[PDB]
Ligand binder design. Structure first.
Ligand SMILES: *[C@@H]1O[C@H](CO)[C@H](O)[C@H](O[C@@H]2O[C@H](CO)[C@H](O)[C@H](O[C@]3(C(=O)O)C[C@H](O)[C@@H](NC(C)=O)[C@H]([C@H](O)[C@H](O)CO)O3)[C@H]2O)[C@H]1NC(C)=O
Ligand SMILES: [Cl-]
Ligand SMILES: [Cl-]
Length: 767
C-alpha cells in the first residue's frame, strides 16, 4: 500500500496486555514485524522514535484504551476498525453480533447451542473471534454466525455496505478511490494548489478526508467532485456508482415541525403565502436539481414541503410561474427531552490572543484564551470525544479550568497543551511563551549552549553512554545535528523542541527550555492592543478596541473629510479601492491619516500624510496603491498589515474582520472605528444559483453570512478585510462596496488581495 492499510496517530499510546515489544530501526521495519503475524493477530503497533522500540499488539481502540504519550506513533490496522462490509465480506472484521433477524450469535469457540463446523481451531486465518459475524466459506450471501436459537443453526447478519465501491445518498461519507470526473479528467490532489488555487485545504478540514486526489463531497454538493488537472476546468462532479443496499441508520422523523424541519416527513403541500407545491420529480414551472434521484435520503416525495438543504424551515418550489420557491408553515411538535433546540457542535470562535499570551512555571495556573498549538493546529474542546476520546474532562479535573478548547495543563506536564482537531495528531503543546541564546521554530537548527532540562537536571553528554546507553543520537550517528558535549538539541525536529539525554538515572531524556528568538521590532499584522474580536451574531458589529487595527488608514480629502478606508502595507504604501480615487486624479488631493480611532476629533498622536503617488491596478483597476509623501512612523498604534502569499486562497469558514468608520446615522458608535466578524465563503459555494450565480471571479473573495445576517455595507470603501492566521492578521480582502454589498442570504464580495501581491510588490520595488 504501503501504510495505506493503517490509521496513524502521533502522540497516542494504546495500552495493551497481549503484546510483543522489540527493537526496530524504522516504522516500516516495525510494520513488517506486525504483518509477519505470529502468536496473535497484530491489530495495531506502536513505534517509539527516540528509543528504537516497537510494540506489536492484538488490541485496537475499539477493544482497549488510548492515552496521550511522548514521541510514540500509533498505527491501527484499518480493517479491524472498519465496521462495514464490501462484497461478500470475506475480509470483514467488524463486531456485528446479531443476525439479520436480530438473533444473538453463538461464539465460534462454543459448541452450544450448536457444535460448529467452522471454528478458530479449523479456520485459524478466518478471524472467527467472539460471536461476531464472519464469512469463513466466502458465501455469496455475506456474514453469518451460529445462533443462540437452538432450533436455528445459523443465519446471516445485516452488515451495512462499505463506501469503497459505491456511495450512499449524495456521497457525504464517500471514501472511495475514484479519482476522475464525469468527463474523465484526472482530479487535482486536495493538498495541491496547481493548476487550481483553492480553499479546500486538507490540513484545515482533516475530518473531511480530502485524501490524495479522490472525489469527495465535503460541502453538500449534489455528488462527490474534485478540482481538475485541466487548467480550463476548475472543478467537476464525479461519476460515483450508487449503492443498491439500504442507507445507514438515520432519524428520528417527524410529521410536525422540529427546528429547521430537516427531519420533517409529513404531507403538507402548500406554502405560507398559500401557494401549491410543485412535485420535486417535475421540472415545470421551475427547473431545479433538488430531485429524488439526486437526494434519495431526503424523501423528496410528491410535492410535500421538505428542507433537503440548509434552509431555515421546510420549503418547496411552487406551481406559480411567478414564485420560484417559498417556505412552508409547518406546525411545531410538542414536548420531549431530545429536540429541545439542543444538539450538534458548531465549534467556538477564534479567541486566541494576537499579543502572544504567556504562562508561568509549568502553566498549570494558565487561564487564557489561547487555543492554537505550536504548529498552528486548532485545539479540540475538552468536553468533546471527537476526533480524540480522552478522560481530561472538567468532571475528572474540576480545578484545571477545562473550558471550551483553551490550552491547559491538567496532568501537570511541562507546559499548556490541548488535544488537536487533526485526527492524525492526538495532542501538541500550545503556541505560548513562558512569562542571547534562543531558537527559531522547533529548534532543529539550534546550536546554542543551554545544557539544562526543564526540571533542572543537567544533560548527559551526547558522546557518553553512561548513565544512559543510547544506540541512536550519538555524534557519529547524527554528524550534522551538532551533538557536542551536552548541549540541548533537536536532531529529530520533535514538535517539543530541543531536548537531551539526562544525567538522572531514572529519566532517559527531557526537554530543555530554549526561548524563541525575540525579533527586531514591530512585525506586520501583529496589533499591540488585543482586538476585541466582535462575535458574529451582532448587527453593525462593534466599536474596535482603540488601535487594535494599526494598519487601518482613513483616506481624507484636503478638507478633513473621511471618505474611505485603506490598509498600511509598509511605511510608504497604503492599499485601497480604486473607487476611492474617482473624485480626483491628483495625489495631492488625498490625506492618509494613521493610528486613528476617532473619525472627527483625532487623538494628538494621529499621523496625517499626503499621498505623492497613485498607482491603479491595471488588469482589474479595482484597487490602487497610495505612496505616502513621507514614510509613516511605525509605532504601537501604526503597524502595517501582512500581505498573503501569491494566490493564497483563504479556507471556507475562516473567520475574518472587516474594519472601518461606519456612515450610519441612528446608532451607537458613530465616528468610531468599528469591526465586524465575517466568515469567508469559498468561491464555489458563493457562486451557486441561490447566491451569486457564476458572478464571482477568482480575483475576488466572499465573506459574510448566508442566513439573513445583515443587509448594509460594512467598513469603508477601500477598507481592510483581515484574517488571523497562526500568529498574525493577514490582509486577505479590500472592501470595494460597488462590487456587491452583503444582503440577506448573500455574502459580500471583496477584492482577493492574494491575486494582486506580485503586482503590489512589483510597484513597491520600482517606485
Ligand atoms: C455553534 O455555532 C452556533 C450556530 O451555528 C451558535 O452560535 C453556538 O453558540 C451556542 O448557541 C447554542 C444555541 O443555539 C447553545 O445553547 C450554546 O450554549 C452552550 C453549548 O451548548 O455549547 C450551552 C452549555 O451550557 C455550555 N456547553 C455544554 C454544557 O456543552 C456552553 C456555555 O457554558 C453556556 O452557553 C452558558 O450557559 O454553551 C451557545 O453558546 C456555537 N457553539 C459554541 C460557541 O460552542
Ligand atoms: Cl490523554
Ligand atoms: Cl454447518
Amino acid at each position: 500500500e504501503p501504510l495505506d492499510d493503517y490509521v496513524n496517530t502521533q502522540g497516542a499510546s494504546l495500552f495493551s496486555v497481549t503484546k510483543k515489544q522489540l527493537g526496530a530501526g524504522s516504522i516500516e521495519e516495525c510494520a513488517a514485524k506486525c504483518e509477519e503475524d505470529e502468536e496473535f493477530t497484530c491489530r495495531a503497533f506502536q513505534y517509539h522514535s527516540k528509543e528504537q522500540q516497537c510494540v506489536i499488539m492484538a488490541e485496537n481502540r475499539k477493544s482497549s484504551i488510548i492515552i496521550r504519550m511522548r514521541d510514540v506513533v500509533l498505527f491501527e490496522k484499518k480493517v479491524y476498525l472498519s465496521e462495514c462490509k464490501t462484497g461478500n465480506g470475506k475480509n470483514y472484521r467488524g463486531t456485528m453480533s446479531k443476525t439479520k433477524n436480530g438473533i444473538t450469535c453463538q461464539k465460534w469457540s462454543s459448541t452450544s447451542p450448536h457444535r460448529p463446523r467452522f471454528s478458530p481451531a479449523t479456520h485459524p486465518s478466518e478471524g472467527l473471534e467472539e460471536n461476531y459475524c464472519r464469512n469463513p466459506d466466502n458465501d455469496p450471501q455475506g456474514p453469518w454466525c451460529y445462533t443462540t436459537d437452538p432450533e436455528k443453526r445459523y443465519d446471516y447478519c445485516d452488515i451495512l455496505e462499505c463506501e469503497e465501491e459505491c456511495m450512499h445518498c449524495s456521497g457525504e461519507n464517500y471514501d472511495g478511490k475514484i479519482s476522475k470526473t464525469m468527463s474523465g479528467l484526472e482530479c487535482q490532489a486536495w493538498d495541491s494548489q496547481s493548476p487550481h488555487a483553492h480553499g479546500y485545504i486538507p490540513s484545515k478540514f482533516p475530518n473531511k478526508n480530502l485524501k490524495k486526489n479522490y472525489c469527495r463531497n465535503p460541502d453538500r454538493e449534489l455528488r462527490p467532485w474534485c478540482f481538475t488537472t485541466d487548467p480550463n476546468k476548475r472543478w467537476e462532479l464525479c461519476d460515483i456508482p450508487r449503492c443498491t443496499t439500504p442507507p445507514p441508520s438515520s432519524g428520528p422523523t417527524y410529521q410536525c415541525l422540529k427546528g429547521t424541519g430537516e427531519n420533517y416527513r409529513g404531507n403538507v403541500a402548500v406554502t405560507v403565502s398559500g401557494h401549491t407545491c410543485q412535485h420535486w420529480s417535475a421540472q415545470t414551472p421551475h427547473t431545479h436539481n433538488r430531485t429524488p434521484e439526486n437526494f434519495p435520503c431526503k424523501n423528496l416525495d410528491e410535492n410535500y414541503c421538505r428542507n433537503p438543504d440548509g434552509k431555515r424551515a421546510p420549503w418547496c418550489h411552487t406551481t406559480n410561474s411567478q414564485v420560484r420557491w417559498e417556505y412552508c408553515k409547518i406546525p411545531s411538535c410538542d414536548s420531549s427531552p431530545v429536540s429541545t433546540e439542543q444538539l450538534a457542535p458548531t465549534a467556538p470562535p477564534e479567541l486566541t490572543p494576537v499579543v502572544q499570551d504567556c504562562y508561568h512555571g509549568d502553566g498549570q495556573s494558565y487561564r487564557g484564551t489561547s487555543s492554537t498549538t505550536t504548529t498552528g493546529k486548532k485545539c479540540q474542546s475538552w468536553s468533546s470525544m471527537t476526533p480524540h476520546r480522552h478522560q481530561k474532562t472538567p468532571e475528572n479535573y474540576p480545578n484545571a479550568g477545562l473550558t471550551m478548547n483553551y490550552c491547559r495543563n491538567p496532568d501537570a506536564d511541562k507546559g499548556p497543551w490541548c488535544f488537536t482537531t487533526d485526527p492524525s495528531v492526538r495532542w501538541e503543546y500550545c503556541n505560548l511563551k513562558k512569562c542571547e541564546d534562543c531558537m527559531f521554530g522547533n529548534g532543529k537548527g539550534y546550536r546554542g549552549k543551554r545544557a539544562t532540562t526543564v526540571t533542572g537536571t543537567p544533560c548527559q553528554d551526547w558522546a557518553a553512554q553512561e548513565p544512559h546507553r543510547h544506540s541512536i543520537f550519538t555524534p557519529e550517528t547524527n554528524p550534522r545535528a551538532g551533538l557536542e558535549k551536552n548541549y540541548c538539541r533537536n536532531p529529530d525536529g520533535d514538535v517539543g523542541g530541543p531536548w537531551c539525554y539526562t544525567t538522572n538515572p531514572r529519566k532517559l531524556y527531557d526537554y530543555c527550555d530554549v526561548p524563541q528568538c525575540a525579533a527586531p521590532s514591530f512585525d506586520c499584522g501583529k496589533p499591540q492592543v488585543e482586538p476585541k474580536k466582535c462575535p458574529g451574531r451582532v448587527v453593525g458589529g462593534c466599536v474596535a478596541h482603540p488601535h487594535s487595527w494599526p494598519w487601518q488608514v482613513s483616506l481624507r480629502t484636503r478638507f478633513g473629510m473621511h471618505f474611505c478606508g485603506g490598509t498600511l502595507i509598509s511605511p510608504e504604501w497604503v492599499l485601497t479601492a480604486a473607487h476611492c480615487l474617482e473624485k480626483s486624479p491628483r495625489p495631492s488631493s488625498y490625506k492618509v491619516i494613521l493610528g486613528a480611532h476617532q473619525e472627527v476629533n483625532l487623538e494628538p498622536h494621529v499621523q496625517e500624510i499626503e499621498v505623492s503617488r497613485l498607482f491603479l491596478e491595471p488588469t482589474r483597476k479595482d484597487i490602487a496603491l497610495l505612496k505616502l509623501s513621507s514614510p509613516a512612523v511605525i509605532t504601537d498604534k501604526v503597524i502595517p498589515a501582512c500581505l498573503p502569499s501569491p494566490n493564497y486562497v483563504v479556507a471556507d469558514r475562516t473567520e475574518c474582520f472587516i474594519t472601518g468608520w461606519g456612515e450610519t446615522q441612528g446608532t451607537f458608535g458613530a465616528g468610531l472605528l468599528k469591526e465586524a466578524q465575517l466568515p469567508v465563503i469559498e468561491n464555489k459555494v458563493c457562486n451557486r444559483y441561490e447566491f451569486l450565480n457564476g458572478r464571482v471571479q477568482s480575483t475576488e473573495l466572499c465573506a459574510g453570512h448566508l442566513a439573513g445576517g445583515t443587509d448594509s455595507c460594512q467598513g469603508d470603501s477601500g477598507g481592510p478585510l483581515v484574517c488571523f492566521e497562526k500568529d498574525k492578521y493577514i490582509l486577505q480582502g479590500v472592501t470595494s462596496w460597488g462590487l456587491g454589498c452583503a444582503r440577506p442570504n448573500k455574502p459580500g464580495v471583496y477584492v482577493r488581495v492574494s491575486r494582486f501581491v506580485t503586482w503590489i510588490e512589483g510597484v513597491m520595488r520600482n517606485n
